[PDB]
Design a protein around this ligand. Structure first.
Ligand SMILES: CC(C)c1nc2ccc(OCc3ccc4ccccc4n3)cc2n1-c1ccccc1
Ligand SMILES: [Mg+2]
Ligand SMILES: [Zn+2]
Length: 324
């Protein structure tokens, strides 16, 4: 009950070479994959190659897994293939600029989760499926979409010719799986708040140990949110247009509410269009700024994420004041 790729879909992936003129761009935190839909699955291979190495995975199983993932993504406005590769590119940028902090196992896993973290997302919030009343919320009633996504990842691994973690010991296979799980669950924005709080705590009182496994999981989750939210760290004209994809999904979920006679919260009510710039400023100030702040505290080399988040922030101010 998991879609797979065709043989030819993936064979096109093996043949793909990232163009020389993106070997620098790709390396930037602000890098916008938008223009290169053709290249996205290929972009992911290259990012894995550069980081983990040209023999970390067998070429054909990797390409079969990537292209099947693409397939188990839906043509929803924001929670789609383009967001999975985007998130994974941010993590790429993160891992590259922190080259000795993470293990072989972490790096390969975390890039794999980012690709999988929104697998088969419907374009409806948790709020929406639980609060009325999807078949997917009477299966996972605690982080609905997040246990689904992992569940999903696992299945794609478990098909024939697909298990890219073959050549790991029964031990290292069941270690990576646990990095992936924690990583995906960690992308539930509701969890993000305690965690960030707990890390500001551990940072300030001087008690953060990266030798500690569960403090690692803490840092990893943050890295995962920081990656989930990276729309807010692009260049302004990219940042705008991505906000356009997010709201169409919000709103279209808001529209399903009205169709059952239920007022959505203003976030998903398109009739409340011009409270967006206000909303974004709010979000940036309550969620995004803090996020990249804590992360830059802990991994200082992630700092341009904070820089670009601040530029975007002030653009919204200007929109709000009447000057963009
Ligand atoms: C990561 C992404 C899915 C996301 N989660 C979000 C959770 C909250 C949010 O508040 C905005 C807002 C709040 C209140 C409003 C009230 C009225 C109208 C619009 C309003 N807009 C934006 C959020 N965005 C987002 C991130 C970046 C870009 C776009 C969207
Ligand atoms: Mg998600
Ligand atoms: Zn996501």
């Amino acid at each position: 009950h998991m879609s797979i790729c065709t043989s030819e879909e993936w064979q096109g992936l093996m043949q793909f070479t990232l163009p020389v003129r993106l070997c620098k761009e790709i390396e930037l935190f602000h890098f916008d994959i938008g223009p290169f839909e053709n290249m996205w699955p290929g972009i992911f291979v290259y990012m894995v190659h550069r980081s983990c190495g040209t023999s970390c995975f067998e070429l054909e199983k990797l390409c079969r897994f990537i292209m099947s993932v693409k397939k188990n993504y839906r043509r929803v406005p924001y929670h789609n293939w383009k967001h999975a590769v985007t998130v994974a590119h941010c993590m790429y940028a993160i891992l590259q600029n922190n080259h000795t902090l993470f293990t072989d196992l972490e790096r390969k896993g975390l890039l794999i989760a980012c690709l999988c973290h929104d697998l088969d997302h419907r374009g409806f919030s948790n709020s929406y499926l639980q609060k009325f009343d999807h078949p997917l919320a009477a299966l996972y009633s605690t982080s609905t979409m997040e246990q689904h996504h992992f569940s999903q990842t696992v299945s794609i691994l478990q098909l024939e010719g697909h298990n890219i973690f073959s050549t790991l010991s029964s031990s290292e296979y069941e270690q990576v799986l646990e990095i992936i799980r924690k990583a995906i669950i960690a992308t539930d924005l509701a969890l993000y708040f305690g965690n960030r709080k707990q890390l500001e705590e551990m940072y300030q009182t001087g008690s953060l140990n990266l030798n500690n496994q569960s403090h690692r999981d803490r840092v990893i989750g943050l890295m995962m949110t920081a990656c989930d939210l990276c729309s807010v760290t692009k260049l302004w004209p990219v940042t705008k247009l991505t906000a356009n994809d997010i709201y169409a999904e919000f709103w279209a979920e808001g529209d399903e509410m009205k169709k059952l006679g239920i007022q959505p919260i203003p976030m998903m009510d398109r009739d409340k269009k011009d409270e967006v710039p206000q909303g974004q400023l709010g979000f940036y100030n309550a969620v995004a700024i803090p996020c990249y702040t804590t992360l830059t505290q802990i991994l200082p080399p992630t700092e341009p994420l904070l820089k670009a988040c601040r530029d975007n922030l002030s653009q919204w101010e200007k929109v709000i004041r009447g000057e963009e």
